Design an enzyme around this catalytic site. Structure first.
Site, short mmCIF file in Angstrom:
data_model
loop_
_atom_site.label_atom_id
_atom_site.label_comp_id
_atom_site.label_asym_id
_atom_site.label_seq_id
_atom_site.Cartn_x
_atom_site.Cartn_y
_atom_site.Cartn_z
N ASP A 3 4.73 0.14 5.37
CA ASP A 3 4.21 1.10 4.40
C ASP A 3 3.66 2.36 5.10
O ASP A 3 2.59 2.88 4.76
CB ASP A 3 3.12 0.44 3.56
CG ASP A 3 2.78 1.22 2.29
OD1 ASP A 3 3.42 2.26 2.02
OD2 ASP A 3 1.86 0.77 1.58
N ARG A 23 -0.48 8.99 3.44
CA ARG A 23 -1.60 8.44 2.68
C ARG A 23 -2.23 7.21 3.35
O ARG A 23 -3.36 6.86 3.06
CB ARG A 23 -1.15 8.07 1.25
CG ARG A 23 -0.20 6.87 1.20
CD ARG A 23 0.12 6.35 -0.19
NE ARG A 23 1.26 5.43 -0.10
CZ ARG A 23 2.54 5.80 0.03
NH1 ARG A 23 2.88 7.08 0.06
NH2 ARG A 23 3.48 4.88 0.14
N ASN A 24 -1.47 6.56 4.23
CA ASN A 24 -1.98 5.43 5.02
C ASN A 24 -2.36 5.81 6.46
O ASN A 24 -2.57 4.94 7.32
CB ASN A 24 -0.95 4.29 5.00
CG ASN A 24 -0.81 3.67 3.62
OD1 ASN A 24 -1.79 3.58 2.88
ND2 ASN A 24 0.40 3.26 3.25
N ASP A 40 -4.12 0.45 6.34
CA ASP A 40 -3.35 -0.49 5.51
C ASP A 40 -2.49 -1.44 6.35
O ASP A 40 -1.33 -1.18 6.63
CB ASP A 40 -2.54 0.23 4.42
CG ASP A 40 -3.17 0.10 3.04
OD1 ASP A 40 -3.91 -0.88 2.83
OD2 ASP A 40 -2.91 0.96 2.17
C1 LIG Z 1 -8.84 6.82 1.26
O1 LIG Z 1 -10.07 7.09 0.59
C2 LIG Z 1 -10.98 7.56 1.52
C3 LIG Z 1 -11.18 6.88 2.70
C4 LIG Z 1 -12.10 7.34 3.63
N1 LIG Z 1 -12.34 6.69 4.86
C5 LIG Z 1 -11.94 5.40 5.24
N2 LIG Z 1 -12.17 5.13 6.53
C6 LIG Z 1 -11.82 3.91 6.93
C7 LIG Z 1 -11.26 2.97 6.10
C8 LIG Z 1 -11.06 3.32 4.79
N3 LIG Z 1 -10.49 2.37 3.90
C9 LIG Z 1 -10.09 2.83 2.58
C10 LIG Z 1 -10.33 0.99 4.12
C11 LIG Z 1 -11.34 0.25 4.72
C12 LIG Z 1 -11.22 -1.10 4.95
C13 LIG Z 1 -10.04 -1.71 4.56
C14 LIG Z 1 -9.51 -3.03 4.61
C15 LIG Z 1 -10.13 -4.25 5.16
N4 LIG Z 1 -8.29 -3.09 4.08
N5 LIG Z 1 -8.03 -1.83 3.69
C16 LIG Z 1 -9.05 -0.95 3.96
C17 LIG Z 1 -9.15 0.39 3.73
N6 LIG Z 1 -11.41 4.53 4.36
C18 LIG Z 1 -12.81 8.49 3.35
C19 LIG Z 1 -12.61 9.16 2.16
O2 LIG Z 1 -13.31 10.31 1.83
C20 LIG Z 1 -14.25 10.65 2.83
C21 LIG Z 1 -11.70 8.70 1.25
O3 LIG Z 1 -11.50 9.37 0.05
C22 LIG Z 1 -12.35 8.74 -0.91
#
Ligand SMILES: COc1cc(Nc2nccc(N(C)c3ccc4c(C)n[nH]c4c3)n2)cc(OC)c1OC
Length: 282
Positions: free
Chosen positions: A156, A160-161, A174
């Site tokens: 993927d 966006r990832n 992701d």
């Molecule tokens: C994409 O949205 C934002 C992300 C972020 N920052 C960010 N940094 C690290 C991880 C992370 N994410 C989403 C995450 C963390 C942990 C897991 C696990 C276990 N599986 N998947 C994960 C996904 N999101 C900052 C933003 O604005 C400042 C965003 O805009 C709202």
């Protein structure tokens, strides 16, 4: 078979009373938080935390536990979102704690900088340049060569990832569909033959490059994703060069979009090549 995997609590377990939950980062739920002493120094650091929703099915808890063990298995690299710790013991909710990327996803960031971009360039004083774009590309390639060496397929790989951090560090995220051995990013063999290999990720990496050098435009602009699109793609039809690419970078997209998977560059070759483009820009 990533349920079997070990969980070394001594190494990874972080106390829930040293986590202070903040604002949601969207959508399992991800929340911004403050963690005291998570790198073992006496500091309060901003982290991101994946926890469950209010429902708590077994398959959901299984899934998140699998995410965690996969990340432990993968190991650390500068260009993936790294695991810092977890809360797994019976006290409270299951929570997976990773590095916080303060600028969010790369596609959205790139879109927001379209009137703040100049190639190769009298002290504008905050703008993106070709250097940054080639630097981001190089970094994702490095992250992917690393994942490849850990015998993962991402499946993927899209802007966006990719998450943007401080000091222009980008990190692949992701790993919820990461395996061990959305169509506009998918290689023909994955569309038609259901295949996924590291070489299919190379095709996706090519679509990601197009995203970077369009500054976060959506692939195949105004094209219907139907039975014809897949015909055209099989035939050999490809996206034209995006608005902010160099010739060399478009050539690399075309290389990543080779019909024959074994004829696409490997990620190691892309790391070599992109490293040379970066230094040529400089
Ligand atoms: C994409 O949205 C934002 C992300 C972020 N920052 C960010 N940094 C690290 C991880 C992370 N994410 C989403 C995450 C963390 C942990 C897991 C696990 C276990 N599986 N998947 C994960 C996904 N999101 C900052 C933003 O604005 C400042 C965003 O805009 C709202």
């Amino acid at each position: 078979h990533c349920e079997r995997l070990p969980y070394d609590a001594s190494k990874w377990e972080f106390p829930r009373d040293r986590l202070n939950l903040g604002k949601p980062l969207g959508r399992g739920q991800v929340i911004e938080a403050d963690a005291f002493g998570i790198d073992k120094t006496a500091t309060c650091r901003t982290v991101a935390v994946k926890m469950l929703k209010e429902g708590a099915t077994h398959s959901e808890h299984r899934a998140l536990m699998s995410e965690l063990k996969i990340l432990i298995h993968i190991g650390h690299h500068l260009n993936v979102v790294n695991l810092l710790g977890a809360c797994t013991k019976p006290g409270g909710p299951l929570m997976v704690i990773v590095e916080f990327c303060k600028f969010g996803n790369l596609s959205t960031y790139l879109r927001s900088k379209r009137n703040e971009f100049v190639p190769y360039k009298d002290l504008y004083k905050d703008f993106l340049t070709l250097e940054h774009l080639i630097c981001y590309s190089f970094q994702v390639a490095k992250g992917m060569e690393f994942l490849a060496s850990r015998k993962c397929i991402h499946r993927d790989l899209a802007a966006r990832n990719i998450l943007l951090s401080e000091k222009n560090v980008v990190k692949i995220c992701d790993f919820g569909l990461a395996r061990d051995i959305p169509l506009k990013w998918m290689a023909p063999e994955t569309i038609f033959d259901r295949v996924y290999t590291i070489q299919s990720d190379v095709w996706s990496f090519g679509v990601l490059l197009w995203e970077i050098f369009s500054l976060g435009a959506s692939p195949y602009p105004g094209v219907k994703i139907d039975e014809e699109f897949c015909r055209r793609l099989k035939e050999g039809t490809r996206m034209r060069a995006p608005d902010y690419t160099t010739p060399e970078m478009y050539q690399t997209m075309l290389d990543c979009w080779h019909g024959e998977p074994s004829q696409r560059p490997t990620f190691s070759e892309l790391v070599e090549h992109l490293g040379n483009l970066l230094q040529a820009n400089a």
